[PDB]
Amino acid sequence: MLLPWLILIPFIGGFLCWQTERFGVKVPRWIALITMGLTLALSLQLWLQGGYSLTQSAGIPQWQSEFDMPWIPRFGISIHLAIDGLSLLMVVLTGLLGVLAVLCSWKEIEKYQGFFHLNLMWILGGVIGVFLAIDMFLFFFFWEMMLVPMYFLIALWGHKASDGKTRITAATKFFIYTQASGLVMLIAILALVFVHYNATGVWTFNYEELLNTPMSSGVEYLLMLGFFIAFAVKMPVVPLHGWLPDAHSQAPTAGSVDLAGILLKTAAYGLLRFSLPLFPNASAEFAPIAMWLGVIGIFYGAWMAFAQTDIKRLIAYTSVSHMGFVLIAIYTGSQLAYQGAVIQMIAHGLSAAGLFILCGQLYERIHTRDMRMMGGLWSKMKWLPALSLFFAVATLGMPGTGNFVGEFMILFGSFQVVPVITVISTFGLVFASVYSLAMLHRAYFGKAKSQIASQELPGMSLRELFMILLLVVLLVLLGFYPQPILDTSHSAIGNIQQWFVNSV
């Protein structure tokens, strides 16, 4: 009953951000902050009232909250939202990253800031809708709906240093990748709906009805392949990853579009929620290919991140490697590795948010993202290189940060299932330490390699310092006390794992 408002408050807030722009040019940021704080507070209230710690695994479906409303009754399509532990964690993460995105673009006093804030809130509402929708058509609708404001933000509000054509090209590549993969997923959804309609005789796009769908081996594999192609584009899984570094490099320079658009892992959630329960046998036969795609993603992303001369491109390829770890975790059928995947999703969101916000502030300071021009910046800045050192320390899987908890619980469960893939992935963790040290030494240590880095740079403001230190505190608390997060998602992960291993 609060889930429709969880989606609607961002949309109404974006509309009010556009409308209240005429009242003043400093008004839309306040409106976006109020509605993002309201969405975060509603998700936190759902967390407090859900009682997820004392929830046992009763089998799929098991929702802590559920809303249903008829939308297109001809096809049996409904606005069907449902929240449980995993979805709740993703929604709270989306709200926190949305508040961070609003605070990140606070100093934008441009003439059309209301449209920027409307696009931001529409992206955030679409992401929350992806995390909440259990009607398959509604899930696909939110999935493809959140890409239009993403496209326009990248194309029109993006990186000022690049020319217009490069931003248009990056936005077009991102849109083509995501929407073509989404259309393949829509083909799979439609074919599953028609298989169920031939088996029973009724139209349904409901997740719970489509779970009990008898399919032949081979049809189920093809539906699984369509779902996985969509999720692999948005994860990213190699080779469907090329859109991501150009989308990050041409995103708006503050970083809010990286936080709102990319750093929320809807594809790993979709693999856990849909690909594994709807097609458990096909996922069981796809597990070796998906595991080796994850291994290649880890190592390819590490090598790409090391070879970047752009710091934002480096952070994008770090995201590719970490999602390779999560992809290995998802296809393993182990509760421990699934819980590690949840922790890794949250921790990667927090650490990549910190890295991208710090990179945006650094670009504001020195007006270049090329690491061949910045050097020895530890002596020039007051706070930024130390916090960047902390976040690069987190991204290599440092104990005391949640990244270590996620990565190592993934590796423990995966070794219990697949040992060879696990040992190769731990050597991938060595590769992660390599690229993090390389970024740190090329940026902030050594001697100045140009003239802009040779002079004193202004200190970080109280708002930037506050949001970065909040991310630091959250990552440290996740590293040292991950038990509330593990208890929140324990029942949902248990249901998904039991469904996956009881049907194979």
């Binding site: 190699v238 080779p239 469907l240 990853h241 090329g242 570094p245 390819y300 090598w303 790409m304 090391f306 070879a307 970047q308 509760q335 421990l336 819980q339 020895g376 530890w378 002596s379 007051k382 706070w383 130390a386 320390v393 440092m398 104990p399 005391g400 270590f404 908890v405 190592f408 619980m409 590796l411 423990f412 070794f415 219990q416 040992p419 696990t422 040992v423 731990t426 050597f427 963790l429 060595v430 330490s433 390599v434 040290l437 390389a438 030494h441 902030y444 240590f445 050594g446 001697k447 040292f480 006390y481 991950p482 038990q483 593990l486 324990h490």
Partner: protein, 598 residues
């Protein structure tokens, strides 16, 4: 006793305060915060030791919270204190406190003074976590913290890029070690369902009764992690290159924190290694080979610091040799005494560097015994303890316990390698002493602690580690006099070769086999070269191969095919009406023929 968590909390508070101070405080306040944080850690350790001895040396467990809990995967944030943990905690806190006040005197007038003390406080906290953990995952947290603090402190002078390269090499090699340790953790949890040291020791013989293969794999991976942290074969290349940091960080790394974690890890999981005797013998062999190679490498170094680094590698090899011959008390005793005299030697070498206007080549030095007598005395007694001079140094008693433990267990070749290494360590230590020096409260405390007074301290390892098999009295006395004779003979050979005019040394160093062997041992037997052309160069080659993102281009192929096909199809739209009529006729022919054939 219940203040066991204060030994972690106080260095953590010191690091947090000194990091967030950002150099705004004065050097007196920063020195007070850092040195006093480690000093209160040492005082709490002294009270903990008094309470531990006051109730019969009972093992005390202090759990704080549960770190992770997923099903059967239960990892606790607990601390445990027994005799081995008390020994390691006492040496870490006390020697770190002495090094901290020496660094407070030493690092005056330097940028990052508070940053230096924040990083050393975090180093102390990480090592206390490492030595005070009852399960392997919390010990892994302390392991990684110690490695990260080592990386931060080695490249402390971040302006010079070579210090940063040394720090990166140290972190990468030790991270390969941590990957081996992670493999050990994965195997041990998959087989036994627990990572608590006592619990795996209890449950291992029942579980591995039918088959004992994964226990050998787990102990081999534990040994790999240990040799990564302790700079042994084959992960020893980082130590000499990465001792390019400031002097107190080298004293902390080589004496208290970094290199003793592998020894503590093998000693802590001694039951699992006892169940796999071949891996324990491999631990001994790795220690013997490492000590021999390190002694030969230290014999030809041209800097005081690199001589001390390869000496640290040799002494850790002695500790690994003691662990491999089931001489655990000897290994921990040598750990403690080596912490004492190696901290003293590194602090004295730092005073040498400060007084010698930043000079490090030993041949450009000479006759420094008259410029400063106290530093020469510190170097003399630290070298005597390093060379195991009989009856006046603690290192003699420690190395003699190691050799007696190797003798009593039927190990002949390891004892022979230990005696050869003892001769070699007298040789290289007093080669450095005679080249450099011929031709104050921390220093005082380490001065007395490096003599037999340090050997008067007995670590309370009864009931933690198994008792070593006792040697016969005549055999023990013959081993004693043989070790003393070997050390004195090495002393006299170094005096004959380097004190006067080096005619025989220069004649055999300039020969072609002499030059070949000198340039081989100077580069530490070419392991840096081998790892550069086996791991570094293909990594950089693959990076330069992949910097174009070939998979992105492979997925951009369909867009290029789309442009090509569209431009080809646009040629048909030439604008000519008769061609449009002809194309309608062509399509009619095609449609009609297709309908006729089907």
């Amino acid at each position: 006793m219940n203040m066991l968590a204060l030994t972690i909390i106080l260095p953590l508070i010191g690091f947090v305060l000194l990091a967030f101070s950002r150099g705004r405080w004065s050097e007196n306040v920063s020195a007070i915060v850092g040195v006093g944080s480690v000093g209160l850690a040492a005082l709490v350790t002294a009270f903990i030791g008094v309470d531990f001895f006051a109730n019969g040396e009972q093992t005390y467990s202090q759990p704080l919270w549960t770190w992770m809990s997923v099903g059967d995967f239960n990892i606790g944030f607990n601390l445990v204190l027994d005799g081995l943990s008390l020994t390691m905690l006492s040496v870490v806190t006390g020697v770190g406190f002495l090094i901290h006040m020496y660094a407070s005197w030493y690092m005056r007038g330097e940028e990052g003074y508070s940053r230096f003390f924040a990083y050393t406080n975090l180093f102390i906290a990480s090592m206390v976590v490492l030595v005070l953990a009852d399960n392997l995952l919390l010990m892994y947290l302390g392991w990684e913290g110690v490695g990260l603090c080592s990386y931060l402190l080695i490249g402390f002078y971040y302006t010079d890029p070579k210090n940063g390269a040394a720090a990166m090499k140290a972190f990468v090699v030790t991270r390969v070690g941590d990957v081996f340790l992670a493999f050990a953790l994965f195997i041990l949890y998959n087989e036994l369902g627990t990572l608590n040291f006592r619990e795996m020791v209890e449950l291992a013989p029942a579980h591995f009764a039918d088959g004992n293969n994964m226990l050998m794999w787990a102990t081999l991976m534990l040994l790999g992690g240990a040799v990564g942290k302790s700079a042994q074969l084959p992960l020893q290349t980082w130590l000499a290159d990465a001792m390019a940091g400031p002097t107190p960080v080298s004293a902390l790394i080589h004496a208290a924190t970094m290199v003793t974690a592998g020894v503590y890890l093998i000693a802590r999981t001694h039951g699992l290694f006892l169940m796999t005797p071949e891996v324990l013998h491999l631990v001994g062999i790795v220690g013997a080979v490492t000590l021999l190679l390190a002694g030969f490498a230290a014999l030809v170094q041209t800097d005081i610091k690199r001589v001390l680094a390869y000496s640290t590698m040799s002494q850790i090899g002695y500790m690994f040799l003691a662990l491999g011959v089931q001489a655990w008390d000897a290994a921990i005793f040598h750990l403690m005494t080596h912490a004492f005299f190696k901290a003293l030697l590194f602090l004295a070498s730092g005073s040498v560097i400060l007084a010698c206007h930043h000079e490090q080549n030993i041949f450009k030095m000479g006759g420094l015994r008259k410029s400063i007598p106290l530093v020469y005395l510190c170097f003399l007694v630290g070298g005597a303890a390093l060379s195991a001079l009989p009856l006046v140094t603690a290192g003699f008693f420690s190395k003699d316990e190691i050799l007696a433990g190797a003798m009593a267990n039927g190990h002949i070749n390891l004892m022979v390698a230990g005696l050869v290494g003892a001769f070699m360590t007298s040789l290289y230590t007093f080669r450095m002493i005679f080249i450099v020096f011929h031709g104050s409260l921390p220093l005082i405390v380490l001065l007395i602690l490096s003599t037999f007074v340090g050997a008067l301290i007995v670590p309370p390892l009864q009931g933690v580690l198994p008792q070593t098999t006792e040697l016969a009295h005549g055999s023990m006395l013959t081993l004693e006099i043989t070790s003393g004779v070997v050390a004195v003979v090495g002393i006299l050979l170094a005096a004959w070769l380097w004190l006067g005019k080096r005619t025989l040394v220069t004649s055999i160093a300039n020969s072609a086999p002499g030059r070949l062997l000198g340039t081989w041992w100077y580069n530490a037997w070419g392991f840096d070269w081998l790892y550069d052309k086996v791991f570094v160069k293909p990594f950089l080659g693959i990076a330069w191969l992949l910097k174009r993102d070939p998979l992105n281009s492979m997925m951009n192929i369909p867009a290029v095919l789309s442009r090509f096909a569209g431009k080809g199809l646009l040629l048909s739209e030439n604008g000519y009406l008769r061609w449009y009529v002809a194309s309608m006729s062509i399509g009619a022919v095609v449609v009609l023929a297709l309908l006729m054939v089907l």
